[PDB]
């Protein structure tokens, strides 16, 4: 296997916005480690001329989620959202960032 092209570690929210706005496709994303909420993860996605941010929420079972459906890993959250939208208003499917 190859390492996941979506994990950026502890990068600032503004830095994530700066690089995603330059990407050419809707759905281009990254997972980053939140500075505002230490220990947690955040999802940043490009759509149109904006960059949307989602908190990767945790429960007492250690599951990962954005809305209702629970996942065992960050990898499973990401993979599910490549075929199912992260939004109910717009069709936003996650796709790998271009290097």
Q: By CB under 6 A, is residue 17 in contact with ligand AYQ?
A: no
Using the Cα atoms of residue 10, residue 15, residue 17 and residue 19 in order, give the sign of their dihedral. Answer: negative
Q: By CB under 6 A, is residue 97 in contact with ligand AYQ?
A: no
Q: By CB under 6 A, is residue 19 in contact with ligand AYQ?
A: no
What is the rounded distance in angstroms from the CA atom of residue 42 to the CA atom of residue 94? 14
> What is the per-residue binding string for ligand AYQ in 32-51, x denoting contact by CB under 6 A?
--x-x-----x---------
Q: Which residues contact 23 (CB under 8 A, 6 or more apart)?
A: 46, 97, 98
With beta carbons less than 8 A apart as the criterion, state whether 36 and 13 touch: yes
Q: Which of 7, 11, 17, 53 lies at the binding interface for ligand AYQ (CB under 6 A)? A: 53
In the complex, the smallest distance separating the C-beta of residue 56 from ligand AYQ, rounded to whole angstroms, is 7
């Amino acid at each position: 296997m190859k390492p996941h092209p979506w994990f950026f570690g502890k990068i600032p929210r503004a830095k994530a916005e700066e690089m995603l706005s330059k990407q050419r496709h809707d759905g281009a994303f990254l997972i980053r480690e939140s500075e505002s909420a230490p220990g947690d993860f955040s999802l940043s996605v490009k759509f149109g001329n904006d960059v949307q941010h989602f908190k990767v929420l945790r429960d007492g079972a250690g599951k990962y989620f954005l809305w209702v459906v629970k996942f065992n890993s960050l990898n499973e959250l990401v993979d599910y959202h490549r075929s199912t939208s992260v939004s109910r208003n717009q069709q936003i499917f996650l796709r790998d960032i271009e290097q």
